[PDB]
Design a protein around this motif. Structure first.
Motif, PDB file in Angstrom:
ATOM      1  N   UNK A 101      39.882 -83.701  37.515  1.00  0.00           N
ATOM      2  CA  UNK A 101      39.315 -84.548  36.473  1.00  0.00           C
ATOM      3  C   UNK A 101      40.193 -84.531  35.222  1.00  0.00           C
ATOM      4  N   UNK A 102      39.863 -85.451  34.316  1.00  0.00           N
ATOM      5  CA  UNK A 102      40.357 -85.301  32.957  1.00  0.00           C
ATOM      6  C   UNK A 102      39.825 -84.000  32.386  1.00  0.00           C
ATOM      7  N   UNK A 103      40.645 -83.320  31.596  1.00  0.00           N
ATOM      8  CA  UNK A 103      40.195 -82.012  31.068  1.00  0.00           C
ATOM      9  C   UNK A 103      39.611 -82.164  29.641  1.00  0.00           C
ATOM     10  N   UNK A 104      38.950 -81.104  29.197  1.00  0.00           N
ATOM     11  CA  UNK A 104      38.225 -81.149  27.908  1.00  0.00           C
ATOM     12  C   UNK A 104      39.234 -81.203  26.752  1.00  0.00           C
ATOM     13  N   UNK A 105      38.868 -81.984  25.718  1.00  0.00           N
ATOM     14  CA  UNK A 105      39.548 -81.822  24.433  1.00  0.00           C
ATOM     15  C   UNK A 105      39.185 -80.460  23.819  1.00  0.00           C
ATOM     16  N   UNK A 162      41.172 -88.721  30.490  1.00  0.00           N
ATOM     17  CA  UNK A 162      40.612 -89.744  31.357  1.00  0.00           C
ATOM     18  C   UNK A 162      40.753 -89.354  32.830  1.00  0.00           C
ATOM     19  N   UNK A 163      39.700 -89.561  33.593  1.00  0.00           N
ATOM     20  CA  UNK A 163      39.771 -89.282  35.024  1.00  0.00           C
ATOM     21  C   UNK A 163      40.559 -90.363  35.766  1.00  0.00           C
ATOM     22  N   UNK A 164      41.394 -89.913  36.702  1.00  0.00           N
ATOM     23  CA  UNK A 164      42.028 -90.822  37.648  1.00  0.00           C
ATOM     24  C   UNK A 164      40.896 -91.465  38.472  1.00  0.00           C
ATOM     25  N   UNK A 165      41.191 -92.545  39.221  1.00  0.00           N
ATOM     26  CA  UNK A 165      40.136 -93.157  40.048  1.00  0.00           C
ATOM     27  C   UNK A 165      39.381 -92.135  40.904  1.00  0.00           C
ATOM     28  N   UNK A 166      38.065 -92.177  40.839  1.00  0.00           N
ATOM     29  CA  UNK A 166      37.229 -91.286  41.617  1.00  0.00           C
ATOM     30  C   UNK A 166      36.953 -89.961  40.954  1.00  0.00           C
ATOM     31  N   UNK A 167      37.460 -89.744  39.745  1.00  0.00           N
ATOM     32  CA  UNK A 167      37.390 -88.418  39.130  1.00  0.00           C
ATOM     33  C   UNK A 167      36.651 -88.434  37.800  1.00  0.00           C
ATOM     34  N   UNK A 168      36.033 -87.305  37.460  1.00  0.00           N
ATOM     35  CA  UNK A 168      35.286 -87.180  36.205  1.00  0.00           C
ATOM     36  C   UNK A 168      36.259 -87.272  35.002  1.00  0.00           C
ATOM     37  N   UNK A 169      35.707 -87.732  33.876  1.00  0.00           N
ATOM     38  CA  UNK A 169      36.395 -87.646  32.575  1.00  0.00           C
ATOM     39  C   UNK A 169      36.068 -86.314  31.881  1.00  0.00           C
ATOM     40  N   UNK A 170      36.965 -85.895  30.992  1.00  0.00           N
ATOM     41  CA  UNK A 170      36.771 -84.656  30.218  1.00  0.00           C
ATOM     42  C   UNK A 170      35.867 -84.858  29.008  1.00  0.00           C
ATOM     43  N   UNK A 171      35.174 -83.795  28.623  1.00  0.00           N
ATOM     44  CA  UNK A 171      34.366 -83.851  27.408  1.00  0.00           C
ATOM     45  C   UNK A 171      35.304 -83.859  26.174  1.00  0.00           C
ATOM     46  N   UNK A 172      34.843 -84.524  25.102  1.00  0.00           N
ATOM     47  CA  UNK A 172      35.541 -84.377  23.823  1.00  0.00           C
ATOM     48  C   UNK A 172      35.297 -82.977  23.196  1.00  0.00           C
ATOM     49  N   UNK A 173      36.281 -82.503  22.444  1.00  0.00           N
ATOM     50  CA  UNK A 173      36.105 -81.224  21.725  1.00  0.00           C
ATOM     51  C   UNK A 173      35.124 -81.343  20.581  1.00  0.00           C
TER      52      UNK A 173
END
Length: 81
Positions: A14-18, A38-49
């Protein structure tokens, strides 16, 4: 003056956390959290810090924006003003 902003997360799967914003040193505003990756297709997005707390200025850091993805990351919460 203001604490350092947090590093943004990495785009990926996934996209990683800020990172959290830094606390404001004495007389400084809080630092802003990093935006999540940002998550690549099919993957979770990261939380903002989260934002950093104020050093007596009444101005906390902003939370980072969450990353896009499936599902998206939430925004970070602001720091204590």
């Amino acid at each position: 003056c203001k604490g350092a902003d947090g590093a943004h997360g990495v785009n990926g799967c996934p996209g990683t956390a800020g990172a959290a914003g830094s606390v404001g040193g004495p007389g400084c505003d809080g630092g802003h959290g990093g935006n999540g990756g940002n998550g690549n297709p099919g993957c979770a997005g990261g939380v903002g810090g989260a934002g950093g707390a104020s050093g007596g200025t009444g101005v906390g850091g902003r939370g980072g924006k969450g990353g896009s993805g499936t599902p998206k990351g939430a925004d970070g919460a602001p720091g204590a003003p």
